[PDB]
Amino acid sequence: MNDSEFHRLADQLWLTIEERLDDWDGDSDIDCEINGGVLTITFENGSKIIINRQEPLHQVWLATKQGGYHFDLKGDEWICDRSGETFWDLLEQAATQQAGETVSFR
Fold first, then answer.
1. How many folded domains does the chain comprise?
2. Structural Rg of the chain based on CA atoms
3. Which residues form the domain of 40?
4. The dihedral of CA 23, 28, 29, 33: what is its sign?
């Protein structure tokens, strides 16, 4: 991947995460903040999900209560380099588990 394409696609992903989380209107209180470019989602139980860019690798990284997941862009989608699972599936699964309420943007 080249650096400019990474900037373009990561910017897009950042906007999508921010809008989806800032627009959340379910029962649970969920907050999302951007600090030093890093997104942190905080849940009522104190747990968090952290999303950051790894520029030299052209990857997006995800840290949840359960684990860590590193993503490459493959065929127009962010895909975990260890399992093949998609960024949005892993993020939704973790946010649903950590909020105790369905967090779904599909």
1. 1
2. 13
3. 1-106
4. negative
